[PDB]
Write an enzyme that holds these catalytic residues in place. Structure first.
Site, PDB file in Angstrom:
ATOM      1  N   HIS A  61      34.535   5.199 -34.670  1.00  0.00           N
ATOM      2  CA  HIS A  61      34.866   4.580 -35.519  1.00  0.00           C
ATOM      3  C   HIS A  61      36.022   3.971 -34.989  1.00  0.00           C
ATOM      4  O   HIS A  61      37.386   3.932 -35.843  1.00  0.00           O
ATOM      5  CB  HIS A  61      35.087   5.281 -37.184  1.00  0.00           C
ATOM      6  CG  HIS A  61      35.313   3.705 -37.939  1.00  0.00           C
ATOM      7  ND1 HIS A  61      33.962   3.832 -38.750  1.00  0.00           N
ATOM      8  CD2 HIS A  61      35.716   2.523 -38.072  1.00  0.00           C
ATOM      9  CE1 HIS A  61      34.492   2.541 -39.434  1.00  0.00           C
ATOM     10  NE2 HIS A  61      34.711   2.659 -39.364  1.00  0.00           N
ATOM     11  N   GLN A  74      42.009   5.014 -40.853  1.00  0.00           N
ATOM     12  CA  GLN A  74      41.791   4.178 -41.527  1.00  0.00           C
ATOM     13  C   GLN A  74      42.464   4.969 -43.339  1.00  0.00           C
ATOM     14  O   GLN A  74      43.541   4.202 -43.707  1.00  0.00           O
ATOM     15  CB  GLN A  74      41.319   3.426 -41.972  1.00  0.00           C
ATOM     16  CG  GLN A  74      40.309   1.622 -40.547  1.00  0.00           C
ATOM     17  CD  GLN A  74      39.880   1.231 -41.406  1.00  0.00           C
ATOM     18  OE1 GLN A  74      38.435   1.747 -40.478  1.00  0.00           O
ATOM     19  NE2 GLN A  74      39.646  -0.162 -42.384  1.00  0.00           N
ATOM     20  N   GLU A 108      30.560  -0.255 -35.689  1.00  0.00           N
ATOM     21  CA  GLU A 108      30.720  -2.036 -35.093  1.00  0.00           C
ATOM     22  C   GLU A 108      31.302  -1.737 -33.510  1.00  0.00           C
ATOM     23  O   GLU A 108      32.581  -2.265 -33.326  1.00  0.00           O
ATOM     24  CB  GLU A 108      31.778  -2.137 -36.234  1.00  0.00           C
ATOM     25  CG  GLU A 108      31.176  -2.532 -37.381  1.00  0.00           C
ATOM     26  CD  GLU A 108      32.424  -3.318 -38.635  1.00  0.00           C
ATOM     27  OE1 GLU A 108      33.286  -3.164 -38.108  1.00  0.00           O
ATOM     28  OE2 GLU A 108      31.750  -3.646 -39.621  1.00  0.00           O
TER      29      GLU A 108
END
Length: 402
Positions: free
Chosen positions: A106, A12, A151
């Site tokens: 991630h 990101q 997550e």
């Protein structure tokens, strides 16, 4: 002591992650990505400035992810240059008095890993473990806190929303197009995989990587995972809370590990078999779910109902173009943590998402989560008021009670 940090993720913020599976996904049809990640905010080159700026704002912790696609662009081909780069990142965090909070995985994976089916097949456990070992060997002595997966439960959690049911065939279509693009029968990025298949396989990979990392860091470094957690609330009397928690939370919380990283943004109104629509009247963020810092408390409480592990807030923030709203959100979010700790819940840090405005996956650069704005032509950083604000909250620290 208690951790006060900001967070980022490699794909990101870094830019240029061409070796990652989501790049292939970004450039096929149909398209689920609004916008190519491209250069993101060029944190690959600006990371050291960002670290000095974070330390200068008063944070004592710095969350970042190590991008597996840089370390192993092709299977069995290890980039020592990327390992050395991330070692310079770690040493820069240490140099400026901060605890490195390191995410090993991630969402994104190397292209070949997705092409082999990723974590939809148990064949995916072995490479990840080995990856987790290599980095641990080379960088483990500088790790402060380590999350294996960020997550991995997101697919199951969002499977209760209507959006995910509507878009699902488009996601599977872009998966198939990517698979063709790389001449493979499979292309399974973790964040695009089927949680029902992946959940036990990913958990297994996490427990193995856990043993390997504990071994390589002499047991002195906390190792765990982070999960997305809503403040789940019964929206109808026959709410499917039990089922949703088995789908999305309980297996991850029950896995072996030194902590659970709690990542919360809002609440969910849970019906019998799916979530309910947003209660209108209510303020939303750019992510189109309610503005709700208090939700954090619920989330933490939820996790504490099902584990004794220490809790870290590894993500908490608000996507808004108006930073004053983020100031209010933060002034309400930190006291929620404090309430949980006053009831004896073992919370050990608060890490804010995010340090910088960055590329928010499918939504692109639209959503503004950062404490720091970035001009994406020059890549100049401009701290928002919330940056120094949360800095002062970090210096104030824990109340006298705690």
């Amino acid at each position: 002591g208690f951790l006060w940090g900001s967070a980022g993720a490699a794909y990101q913020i870094e830019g240029g992650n061409v070796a990652s599976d989501l790049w292939v996904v970004e450039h096929v049809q149909p398209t689920i990505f609004r916008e190519a990640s491209g250069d993101a905010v060029d944190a690959y080159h600006r990371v050291f400035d960002d670290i000095a700026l974070a330390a200068s704002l008063g944070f004592n912790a710095h969350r970042f992810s190590i991008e597996w696609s840089r370390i192993e662009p092709e299977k069995g081909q290890i980039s020592l240059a990327a390992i050395a780069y991330y070692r310079r990142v770690l040493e820069a965090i240490r140099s400026h008095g901060m605890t490195p909070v390191v995410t090993l995985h991630h969402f994104t994976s190397p292209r070949w890993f997705a092409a082999a089916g990723g974590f939809e097949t148990r064949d995916g456990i072995e490479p990840f473990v080995r990856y987790a070992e290599i980095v641990s060997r080379h960088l483990g002595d500088l790790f402060g806190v380590v999350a294996t997966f960020n997550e991995p439960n997101l697919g199951g959690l969002m499977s209760w929303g209507s959006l995910s049911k509507q878009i699902r065939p488009i996601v599977q279509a872009s998966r198939a197009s990517a698979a063709r693009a790389v001449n493979s029968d499979k292309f399974a990025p973790l964040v695009l995989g089927d949680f029902r298949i992946q959940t036990p396989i990913i958990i297994e990979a996490h427990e193995r990587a856990y043993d390997v990392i504990r071994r390589e860091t002499g047991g002195r470094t906390p190792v765990g995972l982070t999960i997305a957690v809503n403040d789940e609330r019964a929206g109808t009397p026959d709410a499917g809370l039990d089922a949703k928690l088995e789908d999305a939370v309980l297996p991850w919380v029950r896995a072996r590990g030194d902590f659970i990283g709690v990542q919360n943004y809002t609440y969910a109104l849970v019906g019998k078999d799916a979530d309910l629509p947003n209660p209108e009247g209510v303020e939303l963020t750019q992510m189109n779910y309610p503005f709700a810092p208090e939700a954090l408390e619920g989330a933490i409480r939820l996790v504490a109902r099902h584990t004794d592990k220490p809790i870290y807030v590894t993500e908490n923030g608000v996507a808004t173009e108006d930073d004053a709203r983020r100031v209010a959100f933060i002034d309400r979010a930190v006291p929620a943590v404090f309430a949980c700790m006053r009831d004896g819940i073992d919370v050990r840090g608060y890490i804010h998402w995010s340090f910088l405005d960055n590329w928010e996956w499918f939504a692109g650069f639209g959503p503004k989560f950062g404490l720091v704005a970035v001009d994406r032509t020059t890549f100049e950083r401009t701290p928002k008021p919330s940056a120094a604000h949360l800095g002062r909250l970090a210096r104030a620290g824990l109340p006298g009670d705690l």
